[PDB]
């Protein structure tokens, strides 16, 4: 299994597309080419959409990436009435199969947060491998 | 950076080695070739050694890997004398930078264990 952890920052909260480093493009998104697409779905919402790899300037996720995130935020708001996606929340991407992924938001309040935040340490990006 | 989580199982204990699968070789050990070495230190011990990637005959970690693991075991034994590496303990490898790694044993009782085991499963 492989997982990609990304901490939310103002650039994500503001921009329409999330930047990723080259290591992530190769080791997690399978060396994708510009304008390639992968399927991605949100864990709480089962909202599924197409997310694009944009390699101009630097590697970025686009397409449906923010709609998936927003759908997950919508599910969390059902239980956490006053919740907005915020800085230092963690995005957890799971590789399912080739060009298929899942996405989950790890809140500060989540029981997994301290350990996952512990692993991310200083970076904003981390790949976690197992098996 | 990246992290590789390897649960101790009966194969590791029986075969007395950490096998290397193709995906881990490519994405965590940077497509190392046979006999390439990386630096690796144990977290609790700060014991530093060289770990070889041995692809001939049975792909595996080699070189100093056994000395790093036991050095961590020895640190754990300071506070739990009967501790031995056991099934379901988790090996936490961290990629620091190119050819440079750290290793830590996560026991069942470590407060990090349940969350890390959750990722594995």
Q: Which among B1, B115, B120 is the nearest to A130, CB-wise?
A: B120
Count CB neighbours of A98 within 10 A: 7
Contact between A27 and B23 using a beta-carbon 8 Å cutoff: no
Cα(B80)–Cα(B67) distance, rounded to whole angstroms? 19
Instruction: Chain A: give the shortest CA distance to residue B81, in Å.
Output: 27
Cα(A1)–Cα(A128) distance, rounded to whole angstroms? 8
Number of residues assigned to chain A: 131
Count CB neighbours of B72 within 10 A: 21
Instruction: Work out whether strand A125-130 and strand A2-7 pair parallel, antiparallel, or are unpaired.
Output: antiparallel
Instruction: Work out whether strand A100-106 and strand A37-42 pair parallel, antiparallel, or are unpaired.
Output: parallel
Cα dihedral A11, A42, A101, A9 in deg (nearest 10): 10
The tokens for B94 are 């961290």
- Angle, in degrees to the nearest 10, between helices A113-120 and B113-120: 80
Contact between A115 and B115 using a beta-carbon 8 Å cutoff: yes
Q: How was this structure determined?
A: X-ray
Q: Which residues of B touch A112 (CB under 8 A)?
A: 115, 118
Question: What is each CA distance from A100 to A2, A10, A111, in whole angstroms?
Answer: 12, 27, 26
Cα(A20)–Cα(A53) distance, rounded to whole angstroms? 10
Q: Which among A115, A121, A123 is the nearest to B116, CB-wise?
A: A115
**What are the φ and ψ backbone dihedral angles of B110, each rounded to 5 degrees?**
-60, 140
Contact between A129 and B1 using a beta-carbon 8 Å cutoff: no
Contact between A118 and B112 using a beta-carbon 8 Å cutoff: yes
**What are the φ and ψ backbone dihedral angles of B50, each rounded to 5 degrees?**
-100, 135
Instruction: Work out whether strand B36-42 and strand A90-97 pair parallel, antiparallel, or are unpaired.
Output: unpaired
Instruction: Chain B: give the shortest CA distance to residue A111, in Å.
Output: 8
Count CB neighbours of B79 within 10 A: 7
Cα(A121)–Cα(A20) distance, rounded to whole angstroms? 17
Residue B27: name the closest of A127, A116, A101 by CA.
A127
Place of tokens 């046979």: B34
Write the secondary structure of chain B as one string of H (helix), E (strand) and C (coil): CEEEEEECCHHHHHHCCCECCHHHHHHCCCCCCCCEEEEEEECCCCCEEEEEEECCCCCEEEECHHHHHHHHHHHHHHHCCCCCCCCCCEEEEEEEECCEEEEEEECCCCCCHHHHHHHHC
Question: Is A93 exposed, middle or buried (CB count within 10 Å of its CB: 0-12, 13-18, 19+)?
Answer: buried
For chains A and B, CB pairs below 8 A equal 50
Instruction: Chain B: give the shortest CA distance to residue A47, in Å.
Output: 22
So where are chain A's domains?
Answer: 2-121
The upper half-sphere exposure of residue A88, i.e. CA atoms within 13 Å in the direction of its Cβ, equals 9
Q: Which among A3, A118, A129 is the nearest to B28, CB-wise?
A: A129
Contact between B3 and A123 using a beta-carbon 8 Å cutoff: no
Instruction: Chain A: give the shortest CA distance to residue B9, in Å.
Output: 11
Instruction: Work out whether strand B48-54 and strand A48-54 pair parallel, antiparallel, or are unpaired.
Output: unpaired
In units of Å, what resolution does this entry have?
Answer: 2.0
């Amino acid at each position: 299994m492989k997982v990609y952890l990304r901490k939310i920052d103002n650039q994500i909260l503001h921009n329409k597309r999330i930047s990723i480093k080259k290591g992530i493009l190769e080791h997690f998104f399978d060396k994708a080419n510009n304008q390639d697409e992968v399927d991605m779905s949100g864990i709480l919402s089962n909202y599924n959409d197409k997310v694009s790899i944009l390699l101009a300037t630097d590697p970025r996720l686009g397409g449906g990436i923010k709609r998936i995130i927003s759908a997950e935020v919508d599910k969390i708001k059902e239980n956490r009435l006053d919740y907005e996606l915020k800085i230092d929340d963690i995005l957890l991407f799971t590789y399912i199969s080739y060009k298929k992924y899942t996405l989950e938001i790890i809140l500060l309040a989540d029981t997994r947060y301290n350990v996952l935040n512990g692993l991310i340490n200083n970076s904003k990006h981390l790949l976690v491998f197992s098996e």
